[PDB]
Design an enzyme around this catalytic site. Sequence first.
Site, mmCIF file in Angstrom:
data_model
loop_
_atom_site.group_PDB
_atom_site.id
_atom_site.type_symbol
_atom_site.label_atom_id
_atom_site.label_comp_id
_atom_site.label_asym_id
_atom_site.label_seq_id
_atom_site.Cartn_x
_atom_site.Cartn_y
_atom_site.Cartn_z
ATOM 1 N N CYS A 1 25.729 -6.322 2.047
ATOM 2 C CA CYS A 1 27.046 -6.814 1.545
ATOM 3 C C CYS A 1 26.716 -8.328 1.537
ATOM 4 C CB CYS A 1 28.068 -6.274 2.407
ATOM 5 S SG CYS A 1 28.197 -4.602 1.661
ATOM 6 N N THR B 1 35.288 -5.920 4.691
ATOM 7 C CA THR B 1 36.237 -5.159 5.443
ATOM 8 C C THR B 1 36.990 -4.140 4.224
ATOM 9 O OG1 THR B 1 38.153 -6.614 4.910
ATOM 10 C CG2 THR B 1 36.713 -6.975 7.053
ATOM 11 N N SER C 1 0.882 -1.138 -0.076
ATOM 12 C CA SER C 1 0.197 -0.013 -0.045
ATOM 13 C C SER C 1 0.899 1.250 -0.151
ATOM 14 C CB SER C 1 -0.738 0.107 1.304
ATOM 15 O OG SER C 1 -0.160 0.417 2.350
ATOM 16 N N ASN D 1 21.630 -8.631 3.513
ATOM 17 C CA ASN D 1 21.852 -6.831 3.618
ATOM 18 C C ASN D 1 22.571 -6.618 2.603
ATOM 19 O OD1 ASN D 1 24.240 -8.773 4.502
ATOM 20 N ND2 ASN D 1 24.913 -6.624 5.196
ATOM 21 N N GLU E 1 26.242 -10.709 4.084
ATOM 22 C CA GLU E 1 27.017 -11.436 4.948
ATOM 23 C C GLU E 1 25.688 -11.516 6.158
ATOM 24 O OE1 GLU E 1 28.738 -7.330 6.152
ATOM 25 O OE2 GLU E 1 27.485 -8.128 4.860
HETATM 26 N N1 LIG Z 1 1.481 3.793 -10.128
HETATM 27 C C1 LIG Z 1 0.545 3.798 -8.896
HETATM 28 N N2 LIG Z 1 0.533 2.594 -8.063
HETATM 29 C C2 LIG Z 1 -0.055 2.781 -6.985
HETATM 30 C C3 LIG Z 1 -1.284 3.917 -6.691
HETATM 31 N N3 LIG Z 1 -1.865 3.661 -5.711
HETATM 32 C C4 LIG Z 1 -1.425 2.306 -5.233
HETATM 33 N N4 LIG Z 1 -0.593 1.922 -6.046
HETATM 34 C C5 LIG Z 1 0.088 0.623 -5.815
HETATM 35 C C6 LIG Z 1 0.997 0.718 -4.404
HETATM 36 C C7 LIG Z 1 0.762 -0.813 -3.898
HETATM 37 O O1 LIG Z 1 1.688 -1.732 -4.296
HETATM 38 C C8 LIG Z 1 -0.737 -1.233 -4.283
HETATM 39 C C9 LIG Z 1 -2.123 -1.073 -3.426
HETATM 40 O O2 LIG Z 1 -2.057 0.297 -2.830
HETATM 41 P P1 LIG Z 1 -3.077 0.653 -1.810
HETATM 42 O O3 LIG Z 1 -3.193 -0.454 -0.770
HETATM 43 O O4 LIG Z 1 -2.642 2.286 -1.471
HETATM 44 O O5 LIG Z 1 -4.427 0.798 -2.802
HETATM 45 P P2 LIG Z 1 -5.924 0.548 -2.072
HETATM 46 O O6 LIG Z 1 -5.962 -0.093 -0.641
HETATM 47 O O7 LIG Z 1 -6.740 1.657 -2.551
HETATM 48 O O8 LIG Z 1 -6.334 -0.637 -3.137
HETATM 49 P P3 LIG Z 1 -6.364 -2.304 -2.732
HETATM 50 O O9 LIG Z 1 -7.650 -2.555 -1.787
HETATM 51 O O10 LIG Z 1 -4.841 -2.166 -1.928
HETATM 52 O O11 LIG Z 1 -6.295 -2.883 -4.012
HETATM 53 O O12 LIG Z 1 -0.942 -0.189 -5.826
HETATM 54 C C10 LIG Z 1 -0.927 5.059 -7.827
HETATM 55 O O13 LIG Z 1 -1.860 5.848 -7.627
HETATM 56 N N5 LIG Z 1 0.005 4.942 -8.933
HETATM 57 N N1 LIG Z 2 29.150 2.467 1.059
HETATM 58 C C1 LIG Z 2 28.488 2.060 2.378
HETATM 59 N N2 LIG Z 2 27.713 2.878 3.067
HETATM 60 C C2 LIG Z 2 26.946 2.485 4.034
HETATM 61 N N3 LIG Z 2 27.195 1.177 4.809
HETATM 62 C C3 LIG Z 2 28.052 0.594 4.062
HETATM 63 C C4 LIG Z 2 28.706 0.705 2.938
HETATM 64 N N4 LIG Z 2 29.765 -0.324 2.492
HETATM 65 C C5 LIG Z 2 29.565 -1.258 3.454
HETATM 66 N N5 LIG Z 2 28.685 -0.888 4.410
HETATM 67 C C6 LIG Z 2 28.192 -1.451 5.604
HETATM 68 O O1 LIG Z 2 29.213 -2.031 6.231
HETATM 69 C C7 LIG Z 2 28.934 -3.598 6.402
HETATM 70 C C8 LIG Z 2 30.365 -4.223 6.371
HETATM 71 O O2 LIG Z 2 31.010 -3.629 5.304
HETATM 72 P P1 LIG Z 2 32.775 -3.385 5.055
HETATM 73 O O3 LIG Z 2 33.252 -3.101 3.916
HETATM 74 O O4 LIG Z 2 33.197 -4.649 5.950
HETATM 75 O O5 LIG Z 2 32.830 -2.103 6.011
HETATM 76 P P2 LIG Z 2 34.176 -1.252 6.766
HETATM 77 O O6 LIG Z 2 35.082 -1.863 6.322
HETATM 78 O O7 LIG Z 2 33.931 0.126 6.382
HETATM 79 O O8 LIG Z 2 33.647 -1.339 8.135
HETATM 80 C C9 LIG Z 2 28.119 -3.857 5.096
HETATM 81 O O9 LIG Z 2 27.331 -5.027 5.469
HETATM 82 C C10 LIG Z 2 27.125 -2.604 5.017
HETATM 83 O O10 LIG Z 2 26.049 -2.765 5.828
HETATM 84 MG MG LIG Z 3 -4.546 -1.320 0.036
#
Ligand SMILES: Nc1nc2c(ncn2[C@H]2C[C@H](O)[C@@H](COP(=O)(O)OP(=O)(O)OP(=O)(O)O)O2)c(=O)[nH]1
Ligand SMILES: Nc1ncnc2c1ncn2[C@@H]1O[C@H](COP(=O)(O)OP(=O)(O)O)[C@@H](O)[C@H]1O
Ligand SMILES: [Mg+2]
EC number: 1.17.4.1
Lengths: 664, 664
Positions: free
Chosen positions: A353, A533, A152, A351, A355
Amino acid sequence: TLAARIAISNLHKQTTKQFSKVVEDLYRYVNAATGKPAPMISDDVYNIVMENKDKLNSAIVYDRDFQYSYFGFKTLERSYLLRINGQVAERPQHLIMRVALGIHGRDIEAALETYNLMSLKYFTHASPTLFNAGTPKPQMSSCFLVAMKEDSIEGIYDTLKECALISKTAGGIGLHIHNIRSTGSYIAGTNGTSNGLIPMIRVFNNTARYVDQGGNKRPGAFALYLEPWHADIFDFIDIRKNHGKEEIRARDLFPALWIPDLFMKRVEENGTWTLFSPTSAPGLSDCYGDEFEALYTRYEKEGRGKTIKAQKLWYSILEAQTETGTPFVVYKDACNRKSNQKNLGVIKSSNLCCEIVEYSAPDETAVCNLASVALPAFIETSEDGKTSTYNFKKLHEIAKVVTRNLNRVIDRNYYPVEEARKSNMRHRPIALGVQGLADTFMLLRLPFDSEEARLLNIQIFETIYHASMEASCELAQKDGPYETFQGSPASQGILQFDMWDQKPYGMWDWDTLRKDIMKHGVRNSLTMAPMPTASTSQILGYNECFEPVTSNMYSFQVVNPYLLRDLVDLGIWDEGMKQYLITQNGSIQGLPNVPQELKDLYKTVWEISQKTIINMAADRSVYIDQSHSLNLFLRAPTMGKLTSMHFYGWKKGLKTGMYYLRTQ
Amino acid sequence: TLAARIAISNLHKQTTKQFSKVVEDLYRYVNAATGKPAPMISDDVYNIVMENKDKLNSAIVYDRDFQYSYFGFKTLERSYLLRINGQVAERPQHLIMRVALGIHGRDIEAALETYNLMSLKYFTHASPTLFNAGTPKPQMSSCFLVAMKEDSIEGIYDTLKECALISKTAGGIGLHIHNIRSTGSYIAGTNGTSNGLIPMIRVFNNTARYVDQGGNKRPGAFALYLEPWHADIFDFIDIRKNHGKEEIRARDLFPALWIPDLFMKRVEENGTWTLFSPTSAPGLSDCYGDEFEALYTRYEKEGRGKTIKAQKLWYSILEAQTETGTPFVVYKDACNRKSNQKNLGVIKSSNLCCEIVEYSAPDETAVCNLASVALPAFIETSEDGKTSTYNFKKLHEIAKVVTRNLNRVIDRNYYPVEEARKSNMRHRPIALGVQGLADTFMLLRLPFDSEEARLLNIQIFETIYHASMEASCELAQKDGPYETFQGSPASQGILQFDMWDQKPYGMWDWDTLRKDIMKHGVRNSLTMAPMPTASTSQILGYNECFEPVTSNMYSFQVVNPYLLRDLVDLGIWDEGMKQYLITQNGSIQGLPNVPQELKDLYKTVWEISQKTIINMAADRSVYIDQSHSLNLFLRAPTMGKLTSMHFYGWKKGLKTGMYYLRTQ
Ligand SMILES: Nc1nc2c(ncn2[C@H]2C[C@H](O)[C@@H](COP(=O)(O)OP(=O)(O)OP(=O)(O)O)O2)c(=O)[nH]1
Ligand SMILES: Nc1ncnc2c1ncn2[C@@H]1O[C@H](COP(=O)(O)OP(=O)(O)O)[C@@H](O)[C@H]1O
Ligand SMILES: [Mg+2]
Ligand SMILES: Nc1nc2c(ncn2[C@H]2C[C@H](O)[C@@H](COP(=O)(O)OP(=O)(O)OP(=O)(O)O)O2)c(=O)[nH]1
Ligand SMILES: Nc1ncnc2c1ncn2[C@@H]1O[C@H](COP(=O)(O)OP(=O)(O)O)[C@@H](O)[C@H]1O
Ligand SMILES: [Mg+2]
């Protein structure tokens, strides 16, 4: 080479010496342009330093500022050493002591021990801990795993905000989006039609560029996770492509595949794959294994999706990795089956990277705090010596120190959003890694692909995992297990290697440990996640994490110090060999007058079989809690090669099949 | 010309006839791809139709479906007529009746009256009311004015979400951003540095592209408002430029200047202007007039900003409008000084099309519901006739009808966010406009720039304002004044024209009205905001709002029907004149054998003096509550011309100096 003992000398001259005084300057700092008091030390760490100034001031050895190579120091200078008016105020020793105090608070002896071990380079903490420990809102965490709150506009934008708030204070983000309905799905509230993932991705992309980790610090860094059945999957994997259709790309983000085994099975069988919108085929991200396969298979028969040939998606996956290094690949079933957090629910992402493998949900954003042990520091020349040996005993000892460190970080952390605090306080994970495995192997005279290296790798990771669980069992004895301990595999005596159905190597007494964990608990749900790292390895002057060197000769031109030693020692290092190095992208293979043993020792990653990398990754994986950031390196890439790599990794039971794919 | 009575005939053949049956089809509709019941009529309007089917069914005159020209019908077909499976289910009469029921509910006689008046083209409602009235979540409002919630990532992203939620259900947005700290301002929580407005704008831009008014309906449409002292102002005004530096542009949004008089004073005096970040110079957006000037002047002396020459910003303003048609220009002091909502606080923005002037704050998003009266429908051929005359009495009568309509819309509306409901229920504004002023003038034989036209314009707007306040005073007598009536200028007997310090023209008895409003209150804080009618004017087949025609010959080639009549009536319409029209971009000036009176009558906007447009805008402005969407049109533009226009408008006391600037 010498420009190091030159530029460090200059900082000394341009900085205050006495630690308690630099602390005073930091603490009393005022932002000049606004006239606002901007203290750069927490009240609590300030008071601690003033009540212990003689002890603190006298413990510091500034000679140690000369442990850092030239690139290392400059890395420290640019981003890590606190500055007052664009001028560096901290010497490296000062930084170290602030961190040890940031982490340890009133426990001065624990802080002194961490000061000695870090200043002597036994280990370090991850960038955010170095930037922020002992500062007023110390956000020391590196990793956040975010669940898309709901399908949503309300949940999408609540999620976007969350990510912004996190990025503000400097983490990296993994975000799973499996629940967002795909292109052309019906929207009920307005009788309209969805445009799928891309236009939503583009909003997240812009947020990443905007919220640069505290205002001019570093671009936001988000990886997105998607299971390969999502009907928008072809455009998602191409999000980093350089070529045309700018409105459909999202170049500031990183795509990651969250792969079920079935996808792989279907790819190898040359079968069909079915693309679903999650509205038509619900709950697929919320189960794994046989349960997922029965659910997927049924939806597939019930005609609820679009059927293609599996190998068509695959070929496209492979194309995208060849061009962009992405998407990453992490096997959802492996992660889930072999995780101590499985009692929490289904893990839907890794995540930034690849890990970290931790559970996240709309109300819980998984967090991790990281540190890496410098593997070279535990090489001792032996008692006769020259044998050199490896001090596993000291390694075990330091890993226990770092465990206790990362645990204090948990309690002393400032969390950017409430979802992160709730997760971390409940579950209490931590992430130990390594740096300079390549250096270790070199120093010790072991080629990376050797059976000797294979064995050392197994023993190092066994010792780190054992030490970390031992320390964590100790803390549970004092402080109680983590809230969610009961019902966990570990509570049943099932440790990581048990989940791979393997016996441990047995350099350590796992049975007594297991007895102990079953009775007393552990303090952390997880402890091991070897990371890139990418920055911290460069501060200490070692090769990143657990990969072989990429080149014996980087670029300022710097030749592998272990290789240089050897060449001079053999009467062969001349101008005609330095030449055969800048040109050969840092290789020594085939080179005329060079002994076989050096060729075998100074192989590049480009010259090691990726079956060797995978094997060794699979070996240590039994001792990893979470996963590890497994870069793959291919010289001349083909679809056939790429394919056998992913598949070999997959059948090895890896969690992270691939981080970046690097090419040439 | 005839292809209209052809394509309307085809719809008839391809649609069900009986109104209560089409209603049944709508109401019982199921989304096939998902099998979800998707009723397209509210329960309440459904039940009303079933309990009144004979009356409802028999009141409808389908002959009236032939009132629409060809472009008008096609406009209705494409976007307005409800569809079941990509097939149109509603005839225009059906749409009209659904709307009259959507608006009126159980009051069938009021619904019948609205059905007759709309089907006979006396007036219409704005697009969202046509799309949504009588549907299950009827979002009939056209305009939303959003306050940036706070100068923080939390408030920025709470604002972004709000805008998304609004855009979802189809409004246009005006958003004021004066409170966001500018490029290079300090960020305390992280010791960092802001990158200012642009990277934040780019996030809003993407949101606009993403949230396309209900899923594949229309791109989001946001205008941004900024006072010209904001230190980021040079990049803000250029946000729509076609040429390089893609990362600094925001092409899917519209920039609007919220100008204090001081800026203009400084520009004309060839003085200095000072750029501030709002953190260094707070409260400037929260006062106006002499209070603003004293505050600004002091901050300027206290050295808190950067000083430039005023005419440097101006020249840049002028450059940007020449190239892009933007930024819009709305005078903050005029808006604020001459607003019945002044007891609420300082008004910080207008809206997407610069006609709405309503108070907004973090907890209140101002709303407006719109309709436009078709000025041609009140021309009667007189009793002898041919004189034609103008039925001011009927105009007054219909404006009262529309007033009561727009008031019911308020109570029956579905508001996308709580901030919009709170505002609208409190303050209760409404917006009447006009369409086909050009047609009126033509039909009646008055040139746009004539003194006769001048007089008619004054009387039309006097009658609409009088009627709307009369009706609103009536409703306050039944239902009480709006919550915030007390303390308002209107409560003191100060009506719009009083605020311009003018006497009314006096075609209506304003004193009795004023007596009445002072005793009984009015139901709506505001009532008048003539809008572009960019779409609704085209449904009815008249020239948009209150502008002269742009061309007597659009493109399907269509020649001004009033001009065509005249040419045939004079023995001059041949092939040699149709030629002198597609080539002459639709002009008749200088043309050989054509009487002066026709030349004077069929002047284009490109051939009318903009001093005439401004004068006439300034004339009617005394009868406008809010503002009106004043497009300016310049043939061969120069800085000198542009400048005299803005300044002439400014000294006339206009609120909207300029909407789009159109060129050639
Ligand atoms: N491009 C676009 N995507 C939308 C728009 N409104 C909602 N979406 C997408 C986002 C969500 O992945 C999905 C459902 O959005 P909502 O839950 O806000 O819609 P609503 O609860 O009114 O209808 P539903 O009962 O969920 O089918 O549709 C829009 O105005 N434009
Ligand atoms: N450019 C970045 N911006 C923000 N977080 C980063 C970035 N690069 C790595 N990280 C975070 O650090 C974690 C470990 O990365 P690492 O390269 O070991 O970091 P660092 O050596 O700088 O401590 C990654 O899992 C990620 O969540
Ligand atoms: Mg909805
Ligand atoms: N580019 C960028 N801008 C930011 C970042 N964080 C905040 N901003 C902007 C948004 C706001 O306009 C302004 C202040 O933001 P916040 O109020 O969230 O910052 P905080 O309260 O931590 O510091 P403050 O006390 O407001 O100076 O700075 C960031 O990480 N990157
Ligand atoms: N493209 C658009 N998207 C959303 N709202 C719009 C758009 N164009 C105009 N509006 C809204 O309608 C109001 C009046 O516009 P107008 O052109 O008179 O609308 P219409 O003729 O379609 O009813 C504007 O003030 C704006 O808030
Ligand atoms: Mg703040």
